[PDB]
Amino acid sequence: GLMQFTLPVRLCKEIELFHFDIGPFENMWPGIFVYMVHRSCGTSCFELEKLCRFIMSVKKNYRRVPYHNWKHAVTVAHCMYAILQNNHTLFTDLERKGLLIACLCHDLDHRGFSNSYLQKFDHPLAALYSTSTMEQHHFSQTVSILQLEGHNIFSTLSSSEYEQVLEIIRKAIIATDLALYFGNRKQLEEMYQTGSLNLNNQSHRDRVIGLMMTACDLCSVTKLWPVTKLTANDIYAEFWAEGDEMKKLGIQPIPMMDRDKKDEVPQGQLGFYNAVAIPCYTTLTQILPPTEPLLKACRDNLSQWEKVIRGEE
Ligand SMILES: Cn1ncc(C(=O)N2CCOCC2)c1C(=O)Nc1cc2nc(-c3ccccc3)nn2cn1
Numbered sequence: 001g002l003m004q005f006t007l008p009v010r011l012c013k014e015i016e017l018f019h020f021d022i023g024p025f026e027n028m029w030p031g032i033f034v035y036m037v038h039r040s041c042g043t044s045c046f047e048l049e050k051l052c053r054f055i056m057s058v059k060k061n062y063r064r065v066p067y068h069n070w071k072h073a074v075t076v077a078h079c080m081y082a083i084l085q086n087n088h089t090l091f092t093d094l095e096r097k098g099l100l101i102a103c104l105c106h107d108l109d110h111r112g113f114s115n116s117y118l119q120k121f122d123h124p125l126a127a128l129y130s131t132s133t134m135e136q137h138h139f140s141q142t143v144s145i146l147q148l149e150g151h152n153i154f155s156t157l158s159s160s161e162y163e164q165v166l167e168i169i170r171k172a173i174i175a176t177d178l179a180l181y182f183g184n185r186k187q188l189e190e191m192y193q194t195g196s197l198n199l200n201n202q203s204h205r206d207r208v209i210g211l212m213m214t215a216c217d218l219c220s221v222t223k224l225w226p227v228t229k230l231t232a233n234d235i236y237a238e239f240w241a242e243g244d245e246m247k248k249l250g251i252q253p254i255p256m257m258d259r260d261k262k263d264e265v266p267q268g269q270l271g272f273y274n275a276v277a278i279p280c281y282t283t284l285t286q287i288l289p290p291t292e293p294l295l296k297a298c299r300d301n302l303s304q305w306e307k308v309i310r311g312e313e
């Protein structure tokens, strides 16, 4: 009860910033997550022993793929931690609990392939879930882990608080399906511009939490340039493995996934910052002004990708 997690001074300070990198020491990531739950939520949100057991079952159910791995889970949760801490009074007690957990869990048992590849390969998961295929799988793995003995970190919630939190987590994990992001942000755009956005409207909250999820999920583009650049290598390592597998099914992959079109990467990064990232963090900054450093950091990394194209690196 009187047992805080604490971090070394450089981490204690830098973890509060949006651009924090959780570092290469895997064995510290659990402690970092618990630190964030404790400051974001309270030392009383979760029975420490249940939390620690839940975190380690989550780690065990992430695979050793280049990008969609246990480091991604904690990175995405840290971005959420930063949004929640800079927007203290906008979120309920249940939202704070459920969203860090949602982010830790959002890519559970990912294999490093897209929903399209599952559908072209005819994976069983693609018959069980016709849209948002991996994301319905991730929520389903979260429920599984929550129902292992000693793993129910929400035990102390009421029957209806319990259902409201599992419903927040579900919507939060579905929203990480980038196919849903485009419409979700268009609507958030119109609602904010016509002045109809209303955070007491539960369907409005849902959309705003969905946009936060997309922001946290993409937060590689909001890091210091060397983090951004070295993360992009892990991303393409998956994309190109997927492209190889497409070719094995006798399908020309999209260029994003063709290792034979490495030369086009800098321009594809621009497409991505302009079509997805920048619009994402813009609308997020409009709705939640203290998240502006994500937008500023994204625009800086766009400008570093422009330099790469110009041969200035
Ligand atoms: C940087 N970042 N962060 C997250 C993600 C991301 O898409 N997520 C969703 C999928 O799951 C993985 C993560 C990315 C990223 O890089 N997206 C990305 C890279 C890219 N390259 C090209 C490209 C097109 C033609 C020729 C050569 C390259 N198009 N293109 C479009 N998007």
Ligand SMILES: [Mg+2]
Pocket: 106, 107, 134, 176
């Ligand atoms: Mg995902």
Ligand SMILES: [Zn+2]
Pocket: 072, 076, 106, 107, 176, 217
């Ligand atoms: Zn993800």
